[PDB]
Paper text:
The bifunctional enzyme proline utilization A ([name]) catalyzes the two-step oxidation of L-proline to L-glutamate using proline dehydrogenase (PRODH) and L-glutamate-γ-semialdehyde dehydrogenase (GSALDH) domains. The two active sites are 42 Å apart and connected by a buried tunnel that is hypothesized to channel the intermediates Δ1-pyrroline-5-carboxylate (P5C) and/or L-glutamate-γ-semialdehyde (GSAL). The PRODH active site is located in a (βα)8 barrel, while the GSALDH module features Rossmann NAD+-binding and catalytic domains, which are both characteristic of the ALDH superfamily. Kinetic and conventional X-ray crystallography of [name] from [name] (SmPutA) were used to capture high resolution (1.47–1.88 Å) structures of states along the catalytic cycle, including a novel FADH−-proline covalent adduct in the PRODH site, the intermediate P5C bound noncovalently in the reduced PRODH active site, the covalent acyl-enzyme intermediate of the GSALDH reaction, and noncovalent complexes of GSAL and the final product L-glutamate in the GSALDH active site.
The structure of SmPutA complexed with the product L-glutamate was determined at 1.50 Å resolution. The complex was prepared by soaking WT crystals with 325 mM L-glutamate. Electron density for the product is strong in both chains in the asymmetric unit, enabling modeling of the ligand at occupancy of 1.0. L-glutamate adopts an extended conformation, with its backbone interacting with the anchor loop, the side chain carboxylate in the oxyanion hole, and the aliphatic chain in the aromatic box. Cys844 in this complex exhibits χ1 of −69°, instead of the nucleophilic attack rotamer (55°), to avoid steric clash with the side chain carboxylate of the product. The interactions of the product are similar to those of GSAL in the noncovalent complex and the acyl-enzyme intermediate. Although we have focused on the enzyme-ligand complexes, the glutamate complex structure also reveals the conformation of the ligand-free, oxidized PRODH active site, which potentially provides information about conformational changes associated with the binding of proline. The conformational change of Tyr485 is striking, with the hydroxyl group of the side chain moving 14 Å. Conformational differences in the FAD are also evident and imply a crankshaft rotation of the ribityl chain upon proline binding to the resting enzyme.
Numbering used by the authors: 15 to 1233
Amino acid sequence: PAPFADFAPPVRPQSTLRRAITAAYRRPETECLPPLVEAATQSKEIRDAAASTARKLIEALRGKHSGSGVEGLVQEYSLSSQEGVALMCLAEALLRIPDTATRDALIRDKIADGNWKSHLGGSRSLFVNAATWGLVVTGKLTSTVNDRSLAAALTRLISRCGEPVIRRGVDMAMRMMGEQFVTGETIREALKRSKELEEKGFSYSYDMLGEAATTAADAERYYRDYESAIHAIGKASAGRGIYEGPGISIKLSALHPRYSRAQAARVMGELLPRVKALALLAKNYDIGLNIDAEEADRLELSLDLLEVLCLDGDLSGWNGMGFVVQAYGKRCPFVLDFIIDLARRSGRRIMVRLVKGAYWDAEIKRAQLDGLADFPVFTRKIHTDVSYIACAAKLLAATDVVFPQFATHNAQTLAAIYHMAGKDFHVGKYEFQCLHGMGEPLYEEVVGRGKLDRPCRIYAPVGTHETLLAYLVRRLLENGANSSFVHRINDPKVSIDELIADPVEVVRAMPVVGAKHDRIALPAELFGDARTNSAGLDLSNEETLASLTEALRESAAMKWTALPQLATGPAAGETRTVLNPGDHRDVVGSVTETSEEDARRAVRLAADAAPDWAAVPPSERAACLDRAAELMQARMPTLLGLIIREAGKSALNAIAEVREAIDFLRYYAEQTRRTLGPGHGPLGPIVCISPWNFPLAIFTGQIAAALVAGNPVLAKPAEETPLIAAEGVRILREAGIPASALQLLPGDGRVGAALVAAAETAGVMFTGSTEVARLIQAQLADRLSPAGRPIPLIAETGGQNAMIVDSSALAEQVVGDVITSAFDSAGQRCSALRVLCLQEDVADRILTMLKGALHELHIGRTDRLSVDVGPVITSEAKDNIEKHIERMRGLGRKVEQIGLASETGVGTFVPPTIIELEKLSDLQREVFGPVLHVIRYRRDDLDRLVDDVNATGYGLTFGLHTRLDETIAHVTSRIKAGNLYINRNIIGAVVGVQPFGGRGLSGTGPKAGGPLYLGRLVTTAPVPPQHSSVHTDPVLLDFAKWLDGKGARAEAEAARNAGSSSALGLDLELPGPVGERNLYTLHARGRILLVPATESGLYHQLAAALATGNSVAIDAASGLQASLKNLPQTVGLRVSWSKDWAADGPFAGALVEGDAERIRAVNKAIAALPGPLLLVQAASSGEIARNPDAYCLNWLVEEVSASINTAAAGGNASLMAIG
Ligand SMILES: Cc1cc2nc3c(=O)[nH]c(=O)nc-3n(C[C@H](O)[C@H](O)[C@H](O)COP(=O)(O)OP(=O)(O)OC[C@H]3O[C@@H](n4cnc5c(N)ncnc54)[C@H](O)[C@@H]3O)c2cc1C
Ligand SMILES: N[C@@H](CCC(=O)O)C(=O)O
């Protein structure tokens, strides 16, 4: 099959109307607003009449408004906010007891008289949904639950007020969850309760609350639920028709687990027939069937379903098909043009529900994460209001061919449209709509001859407690944010004049019409003045898909090559082809590999050229990196094609990798501009050995850092992926890196070994396996710099990454993050999820959902957008992974695998696999493939489990899914890993936002994409930006006092200076996208091995280690035991003496004192220690006397990155204030 010939063909050729939609997707806000203002303009007379009507409605709303039930309960029992939240959580839990008499007995006999804890909230915290009840009680969203505060509050309120307050809480929650948040628990109950307002002139559309199917079984459940509801609604409608009678609303995401543009062929083949069958049933009963609008990247896909349905002759004669359009979206007027034309062509009077939109804060976050040009929604609330009124004018001009349905709770919006529609009205011309239990106060001033005599359809949620709680936060934020009408009308500090303000005239009078909100960053400006964010590509945009298709095809027609590019020019060598891992018939290019002799020559040439590159000023070296970033951004589509075909990656992952390469270049450039001066001299020639799994990004990151720190580079790319490396070198050279400063040496591991062994090699940057890093460490321990000090090694070496999930996590969120973390990139990320740990009480349900989601993945050659998982890199990798799977299977462990299509046979594929283990110790080696292991744990054994995760010795990435603050605090304080992720996936660390790198068996540090990286690549490290701490280690202070008491005044002063200079305790938040908090902290590394030679050297080593929070093991062969007598117990607790260093590890670093040959000997003994590669610092006794910084404190602390998804509860609290 020709490369990319079937990458992403659209469902149908795009008409002129469809292209106008796509053209507006991310149109600048200043371009969108002027035509909306023009379309929304009304005469002065109408505006005065509309303001008068709006004032009348608002005066009625404020005149009949009473205090809510929850407020009256809080008042009656003098509850604090936390007590109110806790009470509603208890009431929710008591309502999970189905039998009434049993529940009432538990309240009277167990709950009221004392400890609620012994009787409820065991496997499941009482407070799982406290973020939701927090919104109900306080109006404020808090993303995680302080379950210790709520437990204290519940104990306090029960001990104070007893059974009467529990009774009132239960009755209140019963009413709210059975009658307010839903019209009824079941469609039959909802229908029964609908007759009252139908007799007053309201109508209904029932919302069955399903969305976001994760498995085929979920989708089938939502389908049969919609089918049964249509029968009930149609029986009840009893021939009333689509305007007077009730209808149903559906969400397409409920009806297929892979509802996305990437899976468009499956959507049209599998989802469409299901909608058609439901529509045929709605037709037979003559009821409305409305398609709800969801995320912006589903809008245009949903239009293809609407088109086919409206043109399908089997549905003719029925006008009940309906469709939502969101006015906060920039495409809205163009979507309406398309729908109105479709209604004309089909002869169907499409029911068009105009809404503002329910996903605003999620759309802001997604555009920022994806680095896109602009948002697909407005960023000022008043812009959405003008858009709404402009689109209403368009709909009101077309009431002969569509049925407009104006869904809004805003009385100003309502009044404007009521007067815009004019005097002639009949039922069927248009209607308003509102939400059950929210809009009735307003629309009881609208419906009926005694009011405005306009009808209103009530959108009526129907479902159980579990179903309604799933996305209730999103629903509450619709009317509960600071800019929301409903919130403002309940604000006594908001005047009626402010509420009837005309958005159209206010926008017109702004100095810059349509300006972006001042407090929302465009994705390109996420980092402000520090650096320019890389830009991505929108794979839901048909223009982008069409242009990418052509650029990818053109990339496959190119003759890609990689050569040994020495300072003197290209070199000759053995030449072989490079094959596509997904199809070995696809020759991607040719590589000429380096001889060991030319590798040694290249190091000599780099040493010769080192002074000339060091002499380029840091600002100009940084300018080279910035130029290279511009070139990679411009070349991204071609680079994507090469990464897809050479490395076996999906287009989605290739985009993210090119972004990361750009980000490394710009980040290390900025860090250079912040730090490097004449005193930060380069190490010398640096050997950069890069992996095949990130063959552009990690390749570029290591090289850019070394180059910009002033070092010439020997770049040794992975044997499997030389072509993208050669292209990266071409770009850096074009950007101004001299050929003598950057030499490319393709080949296997003996090229890397020859480079590492060369006498002029001054440092090594390695990313790859622990075994190979260990062999490199042994090579380097043979050598010293010309100054007689160890050759620095930065080695990043993988992990055995775990995710812990408790019973408070939302299963659908968990499963999405697990599927991504374990199987993205065929599990070939060092960050990938390897062990999922499920709390026993929820393990079976989550495992069922996970296996169902597994079988929805598409595996194949990655030149198709529909492929989720590509090949593994080689046949040897495939064989290694499959041997592990079969060993587990042979031991009797449950193995789940997806079936592979026959087309995979021409490449090297491993199917995504789930293996159920009894305990974590059952997994003994790192399996670098799409293989997820699952274990279960009892909640009381959580702390032991964290110990088990730490006990492996790895410490790279780690995930935690929980809503509970006590569990977050416990787990994050006890886990020892470099990159922590809370309520999100554990992959795709972002440069400068989640600096990446771990500890123990996972690496030496410093973190890539972090502020300590460049300092390792110069002889004297600079002070990184923001790198300081006001905290002083108390054991350091006790040691300094002990030194003073022994009379060692000089060393006591040096100890106090180390205490001040240490950055232990640094605690920063890094700028990033909204809806996420990204934290960066400095901790102690662990136990540092001290190898002293003199008394003063030992005191200096101890001061450095203690100032950075570490414990120490001191070499007993030093003979210096008598120098450390009578230590304070606080210091003694941190001090041990070691005769057998191998028995007393693992260590987290080392400090060595001695002459050059002593240092070399100790360096070899340290390399021989089993376990982690130690970051070793050495100094002579004279150097310790002369240089207070002989041992650099930068390398005695451990960096930790933590990324918290603060939108995980369903919305963004910070953005509730942005309008
Ligand atoms: C009957 C009915 C059916 C609905 N069905 C859907 C649906 O299928 N899909 C869907 O997405 N929504 C749907 N909604 C929700 C709806 O879109 C609104 O979120 C909600 O009703 C609030 O809008 P409002 O006009 O009633 O109030 P208003 O308070 O006047 O408006 C609030 C809205 O303003 C917008 N907004 C807030 N801040 C900003 C900002 N900084 N920049 C730009 N815009 C901003 C948001 O859209 C927000 O919801 C429906 C609402 C109703 C009444
Ligand atoms: N930085 C990558 C992993 C890099 C690697 O695999 O070595 C991530 O966070 O997904």
